[PDB]
């Protein structure tokens, strides 16, 4: 049946006033590793910490302790307007629900789904959730429930690496990657919970990216690895074809090539029909002239195919689901 | 400075005698040639026709009972019975004319026997390596052919025994009487002359029987070479996709927008304009545009950029 | 939706008189290694030759009656599996069922192709040498409502990912893969989400020959894969830290009784602050009793009964694409 | 012969003073106790409650301002204000009466400080390794308690302090005042006295505050201990999931004698002869499904101790 | 058919003003220039001396208070106080004369701020991307410059800015005002115009201050450029050593001497026929040993490599 | 100290009549796989069997059951003249002992070392033996016995496996590789049991090769892998230098370059001193011509170097 192609749209988001303060605080508390304008010997382990904190900052400041306003602690509108992605998500969901669409929301951090849980309840959004800490008995009680006709649910919160292989939520039509994995195929699996065999509508995938921050550069580094995986796949295709021996169909065309022309011939063949006896070097000059012409033509035919045009036997893309399931 | 070698496919026809045997091989197994028999059949039946058709495009005397009956004599008939022997004779006479020396490779040592009788009949000085030739013996043939002021002119070799790392740059023309299914095997043969130590332009002539089985053998071996150089070309692809990020890649990830972050006193761009749906539908509109250009910019990229 | 569990039946098959001659010839041509004397490379050749004999003698060159090679009933009665297959397929067609036939050897599908033509069986084929556009042409031509095709020949390691042939309800494994996970992929081309009828899988096994022994070793590795799965689940749960809910249940435990308590709590209330030896003997007696009962509850939890979060099993498909 | 140790959970209540402090700890943050607030709250708030309840189940004097007002004395209130101290006092008394010596482990060093004041109050000779104790100190502390005819009686340690392989077999009783979150830690503390060189039966008493937080803590550790055993017992599974010489030899030899015996066709073929009516096929499928059930029901029930191939099996002879 | 790119180092001197600042920098830190600190002292002190000399080789106005005192008016002094501006001024003039369009890259955006002022003073229509430029902003700059009938003539870029795979083949000349420490960064810049779509000959000009720090930087980049190729060239060697013998190798191994073996009815050479015999074998054996090693220990990766199509055994050459 | 380089000499050896019969029989017992092919799945495993049997024949016919003249067995000269390598070994050892040299003999097959033991006893040669899989303490006992001053031993039988164990056998000066390992580094690891720090005399290594047989063809393939190991080693060194940042000494050379000439200059520098203004396009052509000239010269210096230089 017709499975409509997925719309992958990067939606670039800014940062709240609070996010900027923490993003600055993260960079300042370890500015020597950031600057690289001195020794530049500083270890990568120190940078992996800076990267991880800046990714939490792009998601929500409340993941940092001491960020959220002191007592009284309450779930109000500040849970949204203090995170750029929450503001965009809040209005994105408001439009999504009115058009009769249901959305799966994925994330790298389960503690972010916790924020989304408080958000979903605060707005009256019916939801389900799979962490990878939620059991299979409870899994099937929610995924296989979520799909049921007349469902009360609207949002389904999952971690990108929940692991569920062959779990199908085609009754939802929208996929939101709140944050992105460093392995694009991990995000591809999360998409292929709705964009797989069983889906009847157009699947749209929104990938939140904090513009002009670390998340924008990661997106550009993700496209490289995603592109390089295609080259590795294509190189594998050329390797198999180069290692392939001739089949009887390949052998038959070689035997049959010109066999009728030989059966038709009753005198000499080709060049020997031209002369046969060793005549002028003008004949050799004509052959070497015609041979060099056909040689360049042969080289042009195969020098113009190249990678990315290699014949497709298996339909594997770097831009479709691995088939592997991912657990954190 | 080593000049790039010129390679020319010499498309050659067959003599009247070759056509008789070529039809004989096709007829005595016409059921297989017409595409009959079980799909389960062992590949031996078609591969047997291939070797016979290859032996025919080479020289009919490879078949028993072909050469004019007893007694057997070496005359001009050793030449005018094979389309390749005709072209080779004039080509050799013209190669010796301009002062060039030649290496002649072949898949079949039973053909180098025919080329041996031809060299004696024409009075050509020569050396020969079969693969049945021993080590010290094929060293002497190297030294004899490479000696300054060498009496020898032709060097007969098998494509098998040629590619070992040896040097024969005292010859500047290579003649591949027939081609190997493995493209590198012929490439190694050309590199006996086209390697460091060569002072002149190496030229390679590849005898190919037009409109016969060797013309299709050529296309297969040419494809596999194009597949080969694509894999080698891509070799760096596997490890670059495995690599954990460079420390300078990490630094660029952290430094991305650090200035604009510090310059801010309020919030960043999107939060600077709570926003109306006028903004969200305009944000999604501009977002898809940036995605399209990003994917298009990278999808067409080769590995040299990456 | 309801997906009926697959019925897997081993069909034990004998060998024709021709197979016995070759099976003996293989064992005799290297009886030295069969006897016991060190390189497994010599044995790995014997194994592969015996598998070919269990499949079909015509895979050996010179076995089929000499030229011309005619396709008749001898293509069937010279192979034990072919005799069973011809009558099995005949019954399969009569009950309105369509069958996917897998094999490890593409040259065996070549034999099955000649069989299908000899019997008038419409077929399709995916050899792992089949173009994508040629594969999708065979998939659709077999699945289209009111299709004329009846048999679909595939290699077990054809490597098609997510291929859907749910319009067939019978899968026949002509020979078995050394990795049971590869065969489970071939089954899950008919037995997958979309299947409406009862999937029956017939696994041909040459009885009292090498194929019967391979069948037993496959079940051992199949169970060992299940044990690794269970060790993984038990490992993940063992390193897992407490949830906010798990910490909460620890804090809330007995909190009501403490708020309920005005004076002292438990042991200090039962006999306060000064304990004779009769008091200690009662605590230690009940304490050792509750310790044994507590250990017994946890000593009964084996690997085979672990809290599964993801529901993988060595007896279902890995999702792994087996393109060899 | 090393006797298997006796591990006993001794379930203890709380004094009137502990109930007051236990209630205050639950009251000062009753919102988190009832599971209120957002699900986004970090683990820090609940874990702080766990710490306070753990200290309260140990001894109330771990909270400042708990011990009876100034001036401060060390008397019987140090025993009767904590339920674990009351049980320990008669337990230690009975231990010395039977000629036994005891190792007392704890998670908190501030509790060993309380136990120090107890040991001086009752006149017990003791040693102490803290984990905040220098290397040469604990060496002398080990030797002091292990000296033949040692004056000491009680050895106070923290469950982690000493390090691997230290030997305290001159004691035969181990008292875990409070338990650890990972069961290997407590298990290593028992094996300070339960190891080669121990002559007498090692008995381990584990103090557990019944109907409070420590009983619920204990169940989790007992679970994590049971999980570890299943992993370790199944550690042979991945290395088993190649082919031995005998495995390859058995595949080829299987039924080979019956093949050499056969002159015509094999089983299914000799009895029926390449022609099969419906009744013959029906027997083939009924026999196979029966053999299939018995085969699967035999292997899907097995365990690692049956699948594991000994390394001596490769010693083909 | 993509034409190979002309790469030319154009060696330039310094104005009188630059010689002053080049001396002032070396003077104010004369001890480190003579090498004063111990091995423990970090590279920061010397690296800073390097950057100041780099800034001095580009334009003196990169230092504060260098340009003639306020008010700061853009005139000819902006050009004739920097040796590279003097060369660029006539080179751009000739480039536009023959209808050629130029990409100018730089390591420092503050110099692009100077080239920004130069273009206005000369009336050059231009674009600019810093990497501080937004995605949508630099996309529009890409399209504007690549527009058919574009008004722009110069494109100002920082060497790292653009990203990966942007196309600016609507220009044909590349000018690297100052070089990168990493050779594959300047190489990336040239291939923004030297790539698919380029119809004309791409000329690459690299400003190199002769007898200064940039002359010595130029050599180190070319060395790292050579080592980059040698490691790419020998890249397949690791896969070649892992390779197990394919069918042809095993077949040729078995077939070696088989014909002569079957013909032999007695024994082989040695056994068919003294210590004069053994001394002759060791003598002839060392002779055969030297030649074999000399042949192989000179070989390279082109010869020793096994192509992928080698594994696809089709047929024997002789049967 | 002075460690004289090792003499590595291939000793090309023929085959006895008995070897020829078995070598023919091995090739004949599966000739269809040899001359032609089977399935690509079948042929490769089928050929690997032929290779292993052909090497056993090149080593000794008695490795095959029923080959040795009809049992009961006996150690005579027949144990020697029935294997080509044994005949060469018999006369080499006779010369080796008289020149006051002791020899380590390596082999891939312990059943061949079993043959060598019976040979050594048949000739009266005192020996030791370390077999692949010999107990560690027993494995130490032979090293000490063979090396002890005034040792009685003359031959040391080893498997190439038990060579690379960090053992030191410098009291011997001759190494005989009865047969060769497929991994060239394994044989090279066997030579360094005698040719290492502690050796005072000239180490000579004899590598037995059955000429015009499979062992001669292996010699060519093994030499290729030996060169490929050198290329990977060199790629690693070139990779480190490319990854290496500048030294404090490297930076010092960059700062000082031309600094004295700058201090020497009172006006403007080379191009600006020659002209200095916006002058003729003849001036620009003079720079660009010399610039293209120096670029061709600059690239030429570094395009000369190769993976074999790195200096």
Coordinates of N, CA, C and O in Angstrom, one line a residue, chain F residues 204-278:
Chain F
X204 N 73.1 -16.9 11.8 CA 72.8 -17.3 10.5 C 71.5 -18.1 10.5 O 71.3 -19.0 11.3
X205 N 70.5 -17.7 9.7 CA 69.2 -18.3 9.7 C 69.0 -19.0 8.3 O 69.0 -18.3 7.3
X206 N 68.7 -20.3 8.4 CA 68.5 -21.1 7.2 C 67.0 -21.4 7.1 O 66.4 -22.0 8.1
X207 N 66.3 -20.9 6.1 CA 64.8 -21.2 5.9 C 64.7 -22.2 4.8 O 64.8 -22.0 3.6
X208 N 64.3 -23.4 5.2 CA 64.1 -24.5 4.3 C 62.9 -24.3 3.4 O 61.8 -24.0 3.9
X209 N 63.1 -24.4 2.1 CA 62.0 -24.2 1.1 C 62.1 -25.3 0.1 O 63.1 -25.4 -0.6
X210 N 61.0 -26.0 -0.1 CA 60.9 -27.0 -1.1 C 60.7 -26.3 -2.5 O 59.6 -25.8 -2.8
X211 N 61.8 -26.3 -3.3 CA 61.8 -25.6 -4.5 C 60.8 -26.2 -5.5 O 60.6 -27.5 -5.5
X212 N 60.2 -25.4 -6.4 CA 59.2 -25.8 -7.4 C 58.0 -26.6 -6.7 O 57.4 -27.4 -7.4
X213 N 57.7 -26.2 -5.5 CA 56.5 -26.7 -4.8 C 55.7 -25.6 -4.2 O 56.1 -24.4 -4.3
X214 N 54.7 -25.9 -3.4 CA 53.9 -24.9 -2.8 C 54.7 -24.0 -1.8 O 54.4 -22.8 -1.7
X215 N 55.7 -24.6 -1.2 CA 56.5 -23.8 -0.2 C 57.2 -22.7 -0.8 O 57.5 -21.7 -0.2
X216 N 57.6 -22.8 -2.1 CA 58.3 -21.7 -2.8 C 57.3 -20.6 -3.1 O 57.6 -19.5 -3.1
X217 N 56.0 -21.0 -3.5 CA 55.0 -20.0 -3.8 C 54.6 -19.3 -2.5 O 54.3 -18.1 -2.6
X218 N 54.6 -20.0 -1.4 CA 54.3 -19.3 -0.1 C 55.4 -18.3 0.2 O 55.1 -17.2 0.7
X219 N 56.6 -18.5 -0.1 CA 57.7 -17.6 0.1 C 57.5 -16.3 -0.6 O 57.8 -15.2 0.0
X220 N 56.8 -16.3 -1.7 CA 56.5 -15.0 -2.4 C 55.4 -14.3 -1.7 O 55.5 -13.0 -1.5
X221 N 54.4 -15.0 -1.3 CA 53.2 -14.4 -0.6 C 53.6 -13.9 0.8 O 53.1 -12.9 1.3
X222 N 54.5 -14.6 1.5 CA 54.9 -14.2 2.8 C 55.8 -12.9 2.8 O 55.7 -12.1 3.6
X223 N 56.6 -12.8 1.7 CA 57.4 -11.6 1.6 C 56.5 -10.4 1.3 O 56.9 -9.3 1.7
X224 N 55.4 -10.6 0.6 CA 54.5 -9.4 0.4 C 53.9 -8.9 1.7 O 53.9 -7.7 2.0
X225 N 53.4 -9.9 2.6 CA 52.9 -9.5 3.9 C 54.0 -8.8 4.7 O 53.7 -7.9 5.5
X226 N 55.2 -9.3 4.6 CA 56.3 -8.7 5.4 C 56.5 -7.2 5.0 O 56.8 -6.4 5.8
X227 N 56.3 -6.9 3.7 CA 56.4 -5.5 3.2 C 55.2 -4.7 3.6 O 55.4 -3.5 4.0
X228 N 54.0 -5.3 3.6 CA 52.8 -4.6 4.0 C 52.9 -4.2 5.5 O 52.3 -3.2 5.9
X229 N 53.5 -5.1 6.3 CA 53.7 -4.7 7.7 C 54.6 -3.5 7.8 O 54.3 -2.6 8.7
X230 N 55.6 -3.4 7.0 CA 56.5 -2.2 7.0 C 55.7 -1.0 6.6 O 56.0 0.1 7.1
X231 N 54.8 -1.1 5.7 CA 54.0 0.0 5.2 C 53.1 0.6 6.3 O 52.9 1.8 6.4
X232 N 52.4 -0.3 7.0 CA 51.5 0.1 8.1 C 52.3 0.7 9.2 O 51.9 1.8 9.8
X233 N 53.5 0.1 9.5 CA 54.4 0.8 10.5 C 54.7 2.2 10.1 O 54.7 3.1 10.9
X234 N 55.1 2.3 8.8 CA 55.4 3.7 8.3 C 54.2 4.6 8.3 O 54.4 5.8 8.6
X235 N 53.1 4.1 7.9 CA 51.9 4.9 8.0 C 51.6 5.4 9.4 O 51.1 6.6 9.6
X236 N 51.8 4.6 10.4 CA 51.7 5.0 11.8 C 52.6 6.2 12.1 O 52.2 7.1 12.8
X237 N 53.9 6.1 11.8 CA 54.8 7.2 12.1 C 54.4 8.4 11.3 O 54.4 9.5 11.9
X238 N 54.0 8.4 10.1 CA 53.6 9.5 9.3 C 52.3 10.1 9.9 O 52.1 11.3 9.8
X239 N 51.5 9.2 10.5 CA 50.2 9.7 11.1 C 50.5 10.5 12.4 O 49.9 11.6 12.6
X240 N 51.4 10.0 13.2 CA 51.8 10.7 14.4 C 52.4 12.1 14.1 O 52.0 13.1 14.8
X241 N 53.3 12.2 13.1 CA 53.9 13.5 12.8 C 52.8 14.5 12.2 O 52.9 15.7 12.5
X242 N 51.8 13.9 11.5 CA 50.8 14.8 11.0 C 49.9 15.3 12.1 O 49.3 16.4 12.1
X243 N 49.7 14.4 13.1 CA 48.8 14.8 14.3 C 49.6 15.6 15.3 O 48.9 16.2 16.2
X244 N 50.9 15.7 15.2 CA 51.7 16.4 16.2 C 51.6 17.9 16.0 O 51.7 18.5 14.9
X245 N 51.4 18.6 17.2 CA 51.4 20.1 17.2 C 52.9 20.6 17.3 O 53.8 19.8 17.5
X246 N 53.0 21.9 17.0 CA 54.3 22.5 16.9 C 55.1 22.5 18.3 O 54.4 22.7 19.3
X247 N 56.4 22.3 18.3 CA 57.1 22.3 19.5 C 57.4 23.8 19.9 O 57.1 24.7 19.1
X248 N 57.8 24.0 21.1 CA 58.3 25.3 21.5 C 59.6 25.6 20.7 O 59.9 26.8 20.4
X249 N 60.3 24.6 20.3 CA 61.5 24.8 19.4 C 61.0 25.1 18.0 O 61.7 25.8 17.3
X250 N 59.9 24.4 17.5 CA 59.4 24.7 16.2 C 58.9 26.2 16.1 O 59.2 26.8 15.1
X251 N 58.2 26.6 17.1 CA 57.6 28.0 17.1 C 58.8 29.0 17.1 O 58.7 30.1 16.5
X252 N 59.9 28.6 17.8 CA 61.0 29.6 17.9 C 61.6 29.8 16.5 O 62.0 30.9 16.2
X253 N 61.7 28.7 15.7 CA 62.2 28.9 14.4 C 61.2 29.7 13.5 O 61.7 30.4 12.6
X254 N 59.9 29.7 13.8 CA 59.0 30.5 13.0 C 59.1 32.0 13.3 O 59.0 32.8 12.5
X255 N 59.3 32.3 14.6 CA 59.4 33.7 15.1 C 60.7 34.3 14.6 O 60.7 35.4 14.1
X256 N 61.8 33.5 14.7 CA 63.1 34.1 14.4 C 63.3 34.2 12.9 O 64.3 34.9 12.5
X257 N 62.6 33.5 12.1 CA 62.8 33.5 10.6 C 62.7 34.9 10.0 O 61.6 35.5 10.0
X258 N 63.8 35.5 9.6 CA 63.8 36.8 9.1 C 63.8 38.0 10.1 O 63.8 39.1 9.7
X259 N 63.8 37.6 11.4 CA 63.7 38.7 12.4 C 64.9 39.6 12.4 O 64.9 40.8 12.6
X260 N 66.1 39.0 12.1 CA 67.3 39.8 12.0 C 67.3 40.7 10.8 O 67.8 41.8 10.9
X261 N 66.8 40.2 9.7 CA 66.7 41.1 8.5 C 65.7 42.2 8.7 O 65.8 43.3 8.2
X262 N 64.6 41.9 9.6 CA 63.6 43.0 9.8 C 64.3 44.0 10.7 O 64.1 45.2 10.5
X263 N 65.0 43.6 11.8 CA 65.7 44.6 12.6 C 66.8 45.3 11.8 O 67.1 46.5 12.1
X264 N 67.3 44.7 10.7 CA 68.3 45.3 9.9 C 67.7 46.4 9.0 O 68.4 47.4 8.6
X265 N 66.4 46.2 8.6 CA 65.8 47.2 7.7 C 65.4 48.5 8.4 O 64.9 48.5 9.5
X266 N 65.7 49.6 7.7 CA 65.4 50.9 8.2 C 64.2 51.5 7.5 O 63.5 52.4 8.1
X267 N 63.8 51.0 6.3 CA 62.7 51.6 5.6 C 61.6 50.6 5.4 O 60.9 50.2 6.4
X268 N 61.4 50.1 4.2 CA 60.3 49.1 3.9 C 60.9 47.8 3.4 O 62.1 47.8 3.0
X269 N 60.1 46.8 3.3 CA 60.6 45.4 3.0 C 60.6 45.1 1.5 O 60.3 45.9 0.7
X270 N 60.9 43.8 1.2 CA 61.5 43.5 -0.1 C 60.7 44.0 -1.3 O 61.2 44.8 -2.1
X271 N 59.4 43.7 -1.4 CA 58.6 44.1 -2.5 C 58.3 45.6 -2.4 O 58.3 46.3 -3.4
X272 N 58.0 46.1 -1.2 CA 57.7 47.5 -1.0 C 59.0 48.3 -1.0 O 58.9 49.5 -1.3
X273 N 60.2 47.7 -0.8 CA 61.4 48.5 -1.0 C 61.8 48.6 -2.4 O 62.3 49.7 -2.9
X274 N 61.5 47.6 -3.2 CA 61.8 47.6 -4.7 C 60.9 48.7 -5.3 O 61.4 49.5 -6.2
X275 N 59.7 48.8 -5.0 CA 58.8 49.8 -5.5 C 58.1 50.6 -4.3 O 58.6 51.6 -3.9
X276 N 57.0 50.0 -3.8 CA 56.3 50.5 -2.6 C 55.0 51.2 -2.8 O 54.2 51.3 -1.9
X277 N 54.7 51.7 -4.0 CA 53.5 52.4 -4.3 C 52.6 51.4 -5.2 O 52.9 50.3 -5.4
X278 N 51.5 52.0 -5.7 CA 50.7 51.3 -6.7 C 51.4 51.6 -8.1 O 51.1 52.5 -8.8

